[PDB]
């Protein structure tokens, strides 16, 4: 396991964000002043300690343009705190929700694009993100003025999926594959982004979102097919990456050629 370690002397936090999955999330400065968001983990178990250490470890050995930085873990009394790229607009699924009407067709592609060119790099190097959804794209540039495009910043996965409780993986339908609802492969991740291409589509609103988890649950257990977007092309590869069978989905090398035109 390879990571900075950051001293708390270093570190400076600031407001709440919000909550992540077992963690709490605040604007930061990190003395080199850097801005920064700090993750704070909630005081936890050796074996969770141990999944957010692997994700910092995981994150340090990867370099991508649409892919969130990690500077280090900051180890403050008996707090672990991830040290992150501070992304100017935040979440894609929150600004897409507060942002009047909906965004165009072409916007939405070039997200889609550089989320699909971040996810064919972790294929590559055989890395598995585990965690692609709304809430873990952040949006570096709006792109909404004449002549500019979007820029987004896949996020780090935060605690990793392998020590999460089935109730929080339940809460994860329907970005979470159904192969991990009851193996690790990034076979995975292209159910994750299937089902982040329809939440940008629907404008931040998730499938099954107003559902129970007994309801998620059952729909996964009867294996019914995720809402389709209207554009046929589009259609078909959402519900190409939304297939049941993890054998069956396309690489990222066809979804992003796919994409593309
Ligand atoms: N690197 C990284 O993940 N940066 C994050 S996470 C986050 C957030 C997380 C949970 C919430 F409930 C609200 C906001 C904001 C930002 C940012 N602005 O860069
Ligand atoms: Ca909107």
Same mark, same amino acid.
Request: hydrophobic share 35%; proline share 6%; net charge neutral.
């Given at each position: 396991?390879?990571?900075?370690?950051?001293?708390?002397?270093?570190?400076?936090?600031?407001?709440?964000?919000?909550?992540?999955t077992?963690?709490?999330?605040?604007e930061?400065?990190?003395?080199?002043?850097?801005?920064?968001?700090?993750?704070?983990?909630?005081?936890?178990?050796?074996?969770?300690?141990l999944? *957010? +250490?692997?994700?910092?470890?995981?994150?340090?050995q990867?370099?991508?343009?649409?892919l969130?930085?990690?500077?280090?873990?900051?180890?403050?009394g008996?707090?672990?705190?991830?040290?992150?790229?501070?992304?100017?607009?935040?979440?894609?699924?929150?600004?897409?929700?507060?942002e009047?009407?909906?965004?165009?067709?072409?916007?939405?592609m070039?997200?889609?694009?550089?989320?699909?060119?971040?996810?064919? +790099?972790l294929?590559?190097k055989?890395?598995?993100?585990?965690?692609?959804?709304?809430?873990?794209?952040?949006?570096?540039?709006?792109?909404?003025?004449?002549?500019?495009?979007? *820029?987004?910043?896949?996020s780090?996965?935060?605690?990793?999926?392998?020590a999460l409780?089935?109730?929080?993986?339940?809460?994860?339908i329907?970005?979470?594959?159904?192969?991990?609802?009851?193996?690790?492969?990034?076979?995975?991740?292209?159910?994750?982004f299937?089902?982040?291409?329809?939440?940008?589509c629907?404008?931040?609103?998730?499938?099954?979102?107003?559902?129970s988890?007994?309801?998620?649950?059952?729909? +996964?257990?009867?294996?019914?097919?995720?809402?389709?977007?209207?554009?046929?092309?589009?259609?078909?590869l959402?519900?190409?990456?939304?297939? +049941?069978?993890?054998?069956?989905?396309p690489? *990222?090398?066809?979804?992003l050629?796919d994409?593309?035109?």
């Amino acid at each position: 396991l390879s990571f900075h370690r950051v001293d708390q002397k270093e570190i400076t936090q600031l407001s709440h964000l919000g909550q992540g999955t077992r963690t709490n999330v605040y604007e930061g400065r990190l003395r080199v002043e850097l801005r920064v968001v700090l993750k704070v983990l909630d005081p936890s178990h050796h074996d969770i300690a141990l999944a *957010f +250490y692997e994700t910092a470890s995981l994150m340090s050995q990867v370099s991508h343009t649409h892919l969130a930085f990690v500077h280090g873990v900051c180890v403050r009394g008996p707090e672990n705190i991830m040290v992150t790229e501070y992304v100017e607009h935040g979440p894609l699924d929150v600004w897409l929700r507060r942002e009047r009407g909906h965004v165009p067709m072409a916007w939405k592609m070039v997200v889609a694009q550089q989320l699909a060119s971040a996810l064919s +790099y972790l294929e590559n190097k055989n890395l598995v993100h585990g965690n692609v959804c709304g809430r873990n794209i952040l949006l570096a540039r709006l792109g909404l003025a004449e002549g500019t495009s979007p *820029f987004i910043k896949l996020s780090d996965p935060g605690v990793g999926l392998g020590a999460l409780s089935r109730e929080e993986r339940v809460e994860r339908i329907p970005w979470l594959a159904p192969e991990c609802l009851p193996s690790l492969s990034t076979a995975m991740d292209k159910w994750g982004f299937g089902a982040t291409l329809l939440e940008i589509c629907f404008d931040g609103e998730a499938p099954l979102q107003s559902r129970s988890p007994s309801e998620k649950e059952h729909f +996964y257990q009867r294996q019914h097919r995720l809402p389709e977007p209207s554009c046929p092309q589009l259609a078909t590869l959402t519900s190409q990456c939304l297939t +049941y069978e993890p054998t069956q989905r396309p690489s *990222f090398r066809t979804i992003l050629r796919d994409l593309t035109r």
